């Protein structure tokens, strides 16, 4: 049981060759998967008669500046100016100036620097922030150094296989829509709890975080057309707290009639508008959150508009077409400057999500090519994140991990969002599963001010660095003005009061149907808050 | 329509183009233009009746406030 | 034409002067935020225009890509 060929474990049994620290205990006491001898025991000291080169290649000084590369990257030949009449004391080199045995001075760039490219004996600092997945949330550059700082609302938490930053609040829920119901799931508590039930033909989900700050977010959901009856966009409250089943959720239709297959829906929380894409109507259009002032936004060159997304910070909307000519296109929320981001090596782009906290990077899911890719919002630097994704149907990004639904398996799957590590399975649900969406506040930055000055009569759409005026379909501006439109205004729609029993108790309808809670043991108040 | 008796004609059928006075239904079928918003389900799933608050009728037809043409 | 306190956009729609340089477009031709005095910082420092923070003459012309635009080595070091 010799160390050079066998790993002598604590239990006196020895382990053959490469099995040491392979990821499975071949010893039988747990120390086979430990740091000890297998993990980085020595760090190669090299002498004045060698150069430990740019990449750690230690080579004899006789080979340095001999005009034959040993180092691989030619760093043992970098500079190589020659003549014994020359010394390092003359200081030609910017930083680590050194003296060689033959022909005078020879000089290395410092660790974290490369030779100047416009000249030798000179070096730049590497801007390491440009490397993909070098920092989890943010990067600041320094001379051969950097910091993985993370933005406000993210506490730095040292973790396994690297450091990440926490959620600074309640653990994220997943929303999981099936044809007949929407389900919740606490990612930390790992329990389902009842939500919208006795529904039919559901297809997609988005939400507005606590618009009235009364501690109740609202989720928007789509119902498909069935038989000879049209679909609907409907909306309902969802508790941010732990309550469920005890709270009768009341659905209300927005009244957006003449609707067939809204496979894509997104809610602009800044502009207070709802964007949806009807596959059968071959258009993507916009209306206010309560369903007034319907306006067709884009109606040309759309075969089958799939899932869409909006980025109010940059004033850019994104959507996917999965017809005969697959493509991913972005435009202003106004609808101007429509452009195509990616149209090559695309199968069925059916789910799209934006990483707001990381350079506003865009990810999408391809259910035909069986891959998930990421591109910058301008369309450069395309790279596949994960392959063999087993036909992802939908995706969402949260923290340092990416979520998707493996469609026909009905499984929810999870992975490092930078393409590293190995896949993880979260849970298994019906083949009726049609989305995953992380229900959390950090997921949509709530402190993004709406630039609208209330000047607009009916709609105030966003655009990069500002806003614009528009009015419903089949109407035009009053002649000479670009604000007022001739269409008669409509009053905002009143949403019925919700059920709010936080720590427990059951909702109840009185004579005028106002909600009221029967508080549980050891809690009191109108909504059973303190006890 | 199954004419041969063994559905030979309808097998691998690519839907035909519509002509100048026809509207292509949701499920890729052509019907007369005069059937669009006429208070009847003609495309099988009322897809012709879809969203006609925003179009005029034929010159000889009166338009109801609900967008239908009579 | 309109009042003295209203800045006119090229299309004829005139906005209040308070909405000049306010950080947001208001003219359909963006003219209210165009032709507006750019930000600046104290002596020996520089503002990287892409991100808008004060950086020193340590890093402007340090021969490398210190600003987020990467551009100091030609735009400052002319
Ligand atoms: C959500 O969006 C808001 C902006 O709507 C982000 O807030 C800004 O974050 C930056 C990050 O470093 C701060 O500097 C901003 O503070 C302001 O900075 C300017 C100079 O750039 C000063 O003139 C201001 O006085 C102020 O100090 C901050 N702005 C505001 C209005 O809060 C926020 O980071 C972002 N959050 C997430 C999680 O994405
Ligand atoms: C999801 O589960 C987490 C626990 O993993 C819940 O967090 C706790 O919730 C209780 C509720 O009374 C709080 O008092 C605790 O302070 C929370 N603990 C932590 C770790 O923060 C969370 O509330 C659950 N959310 C839902 C909606 O189920
Ligand atoms: C220059 O290189 C040597 C290794 O040969 C290293 O130990 C030293 O720290 C470097 N100089 C400075 C100032 O860091
Ligand atoms: C109204 O729609 C009908 C049917 O499509 C005709 O196209 C007609 O020309 C339209 N009328 C106007 C004024 O555009
Ligand atoms: Ca092992
Ligand atoms: Ca050499
Ligand atoms: Ca650096
Ligand atoms: Ca009809
Ligand atoms: Ca302005
Ligand atoms: Ca520089």
Tab-separated table of N, CA and C in Angstrom, chain A residues 204-262:
chain	number	residue	atom	x	y	z
A	204	UNK	N	-50.064	30.204	-19.795
A	204	UNK	CA	-48.845	30.952	-19.407
A	204	UNK	C	-49.132	31.947	-18.286
A	205	UNK	N	-48.056	32.410	-17.637
A	205	UNK	CA	-48.079	33.087	-16.312
A	205	UNK	C	-47.061	34.228	-16.293
A	206	UNK	N	-47.453	35.411	-15.806
A	206	UNK	CA	-46.477	36.410	-15.318
A	206	UNK	C	-47.095	37.183	-14.153
A	207	UNK	N	-46.305	37.973	-13.419
A	207	UNK	CA	-46.835	38.634	-12.205
A	207	UNK	C	-46.318	40.064	-12.046
A	208	UNK	N	-47.088	40.844	-11.290
A	208	UNK	CA	-46.673	42.173	-10.814
A	208	UNK	C	-46.483	42.094	-9.298
A	209	UNK	N	-45.283	42.419	-8.811
A	209	UNK	CA	-44.998	42.355	-7.356
A	209	UNK	C	-45.738	43.487	-6.632
A	210	UNK	N	-46.625	43.112	-5.696
A	210	UNK	CA	-47.340	43.970	-4.711
A	210	UNK	C	-47.580	45.386	-5.250
A	211	UNK	N	-48.427	45.578	-6.275
A	211	UNK	CA	-48.672	46.920	-6.811
A	211	UNK	C	-49.195	47.916	-5.761
A	212	UNK	N	-50.026	47.453	-4.814
A	212	UNK	CA	-50.646	48.361	-3.814
A	212	UNK	C	-49.875	48.300	-2.493
A	213	UNK	N	-48.784	47.516	-2.425
A	213	UNK	CA	-47.918	47.408	-1.219
A	213	UNK	C	-48.726	46.911	-0.012
A	214	UNK	N	-49.864	46.244	-0.250
A	214	UNK	CA	-50.704	45.714	0.859
A	214	UNK	C	-50.271	44.277	1.145
A	215	UNK	N	-49.141	43.853	0.554
A	215	UNK	CA	-48.550	42.525	0.792
A	215	UNK	C	-49.194	41.443	-0.064
A	216	UNK	N	-49.819	41.817	-1.193
A	216	UNK	CA	-50.437	40.841	-2.123
A	216	UNK	C	-49.981	41.172	-3.544
A	217	UNK	N	-49.143	40.329	-4.164
A	217	UNK	CA	-48.817	40.430	-5.608
A	217	UNK	C	-50.004	39.977	-6.452
A	218	UNK	N	-49.962	40.260	-7.753
A	218	UNK	CA	-51.024	39.773	-8.672
A	218	UNK	C	-50.387	39.002	-9.832
A	219	UNK	N	-50.925	37.811	-10.118
A	219	UNK	CA	-50.465	36.987	-11.268
A	219	UNK	C	-51.503	37.096	-12.380
A	220	UNK	N	-50.988	37.279	-13.588
A	220	UNK	CA	-51.762	37.306	-14.841
A	220	UNK	C	-51.604	35.943	-15.481
A	221	UNK	N	-52.695	35.429	-16.029
A	221	UNK	CA	-52.672	34.086	-16.627
A	221	UNK	C	-53.548	34.051	-17.869
A	222	UNK	N	-53.183	33.160	-18.778
A	222	UNK	CA	-53.866	33.036	-20.078
A	222	UNK	C	-54.706	31.771	-20.121
A	223	UNK	N	-55.921	31.909	-20.643
A	223	UNK	CA	-56.819	30.772	-20.952
A	223	UNK	C	-56.945	30.666	-22.469
A	224	UNK	N	-56.648	29.489	-23.024
A	224	UNK	CA	-56.787	29.230	-24.476
A	224	UNK	C	-58.254	29.189	-24.892
A	225	UNK	N	-58.514	29.557	-26.147
A	225	UNK	CA	-59.815	29.293	-26.801
A	225	UNK	C	-60.032	27.778	-26.911
A	226	UNK	N	-61.273	27.340	-26.691
A	226	UNK	CA	-61.626	25.901	-26.708
A	226	UNK	C	-62.952	25.738	-27.448
A	227	UNK	N	-63.065	24.672	-28.250
A	227	UNK	CA	-64.271	24.408	-29.052
A	227	UNK	C	-64.628	25.620	-29.895
A	228	UNK	N	-65.719	26.325	-29.551
A	228	UNK	CA	-66.190	27.508	-30.317
A	228	UNK	C	-66.249	28.738	-29.404
A	229	UNK	N	-65.496	28.751	-28.297
A	229	UNK	CA	-65.499	29.884	-27.342
A	229	UNK	C	-64.087	30.471	-27.234
A	230	UNK	N	-63.984	31.804	-27.194
A	230	UNK	CA	-62.680	32.502	-27.183
A	230	UNK	C	-61.954	32.341	-25.842
A	231	UNK	N	-60.638	32.587	-25.886
A	231	UNK	CA	-59.768	32.566	-24.702
A	231	UNK	C	-59.918	33.828	-23.869
A	232	UNK	N	-59.029	34.000	-22.887
A	232	UNK	CA	-59.064	35.180	-22.007
A	232	UNK	C	-57.681	35.449	-21.426
A	233	UNK	N	-57.424	36.712	-21.085
A	233	UNK	CA	-56.329	37.057	-20.149
A	233	UNK	C	-57.017	37.381	-18.831
A	234	UNK	N	-56.717	36.623	-17.780
A	234	UNK	CA	-57.366	36.816	-16.464
A	234	UNK	C	-56.290	37.087	-15.418
A	235	UNK	N	-56.673	37.679	-14.288
A	235	UNK	CA	-55.681	38.041	-13.246
A	235	UNK	C	-56.264	37.777	-11.863
A	236	UNK	N	-55.386	37.494	-10.899
A	236	UNK	CA	-55.809	37.164	-9.527
A	236	UNK	C	-54.679	37.451	-8.539
A	237	UNK	N	-55.025	37.811	-7.297
A	237	UNK	CA	-54.012	38.020	-6.237
A	237	UNK	C	-53.341	36.704	-5.840
A	238	UNK	N	-52.112	36.804	-5.352
A	238	UNK	CA	-51.434	35.654	-4.714
A	238	UNK	C	-50.723	36.153	-3.459
A	239	UNK	N	-50.911	35.515	-2.289
A	239	UNK	CA	-50.218	35.921	-1.069
A	239	UNK	C	-48.691	35.809	-1.165
A	240	UNK	N	-47.982	36.857	-0.737
A	240	UNK	CA	-46.503	36.773	-0.620
A	240	UNK	C	-46.153	35.960	0.628
A	241	UNK	N	-47.086	35.854	1.580
A	241	UNK	CA	-46.844	35.109	2.837
A	241	UNK	C	-47.244	33.642	2.646
A	242	UNK	N	-47.257	32.887	3.754
A	242	UNK	CA	-47.256	31.404	3.733
A	242	UNK	C	-48.677	30.849	3.564
A	243	UNK	N	-49.726	31.693	3.565
A	243	UNK	CA	-51.128	31.199	3.600
A	243	UNK	C	-51.513	30.492	2.284
A	244	UNK	N	-52.452	29.524	2.363
A	244	UNK	CA	-52.990	28.802	1.191
A	244	UNK	C	-54.146	27.868	1.536
A	245	UNK	N	-54.998	27.543	0.535
A	245	UNK	CA	-56.221	26.685	0.616
A	245	UNK	C	-57.347	27.348	1.416
A	246	UNK	N	-56.994	28.101	2.457
A	246	UNK	CA	-57.921	28.830	3.356
A	246	UNK	C	-58.376	30.165	2.740
A	247	UNK	N	-57.938	30.484	1.514
A	247	UNK	CA	-58.092	31.823	0.896
A	247	UNK	C	-58.716	31.625	-0.492
A	248	UNK	N	-60.048	31.746	-0.662
A	248	UNK	CA	-60.698	31.561	-1.965
A	248	UNK	C	-60.263	32.619	-2.990
A	249	UNK	N	-59.487	32.184	-3.985
A	249	UNK	CA	-58.952	33.077	-5.045
A	249	UNK	C	-60.068	33.337	-6.062
A	250	UNK	N	-60.380	34.610	-6.326
A	250	UNK	CA	-61.456	34.972	-7.282
A	250	UNK	C	-60.795	35.395	-8.596
A	251	UNK	N	-61.072	34.692	-9.687
A	251	UNK	CA	-60.530	35.115	-11.003
A	251	UNK	C	-61.388	36.255	-11.564
A	252	UNK	N	-60.779	37.173	-12.315
A	252	UNK	CA	-61.561	38.193	-13.062
A	252	UNK	C	-60.998	38.295	-14.484
A	253	UNK	N	-61.873	38.302	-15.497
A	253	UNK	CA	-61.408	38.481	-16.893
A	253	UNK	C	-61.144	39.970	-17.131
A	254	UNK	N	-60.056	40.285	-17.842
A	254	UNK	CA	-59.725	41.667	-18.272
A	254	UNK	C	-60.714	42.178	-19.330
A	255	UNK	N	-61.458	41.295	-20.017
A	255	UNK	CA	-62.419	41.707	-21.060
A	255	UNK	C	-61.748	41.909	-22.409
A	256	UNK	N	-60.510	41.418	-22.572
A	256	UNK	CA	-59.799	41.458	-23.871
A	256	UNK	C	-60.369	40.357	-24.765
A	257	UNK	N	-61.575	40.594	-25.288
A	257	UNK	CA	-62.304	39.595	-26.106
A	257	UNK	C	-61.586	39.389	-27.445
A	258	UNK	N	-62.079	38.421	-28.229
A	258	UNK	CA	-61.585	38.122	-29.596
A	258	UNK	C	-60.126	37.663	-29.512
A	259	UNK	N	-59.899	36.633	-28.688
A	259	UNK	CA	-58.547	36.155	-28.328
A	259	UNK	C	-58.485	34.633	-28.492
A	260	UNK	N	-57.388	34.087	-29.032
A	260	UNK	CA	-57.387	32.657	-29.437
A	260	UNK	C	-56.281	31.841	-28.763
A	261	UNK	N	-55.001	32.198	-28.926
A	261	UNK	CA	-53.912	31.370	-28.359
A	261	UNK	C	-52.771	32.258	-27.872
A	262	UNK	N	-52.876	32.833	-26.664
A	262	UNK	CA	-51.847	33.711	-26.121
A	262	UNK	C	-50.686	32.929	-25.489
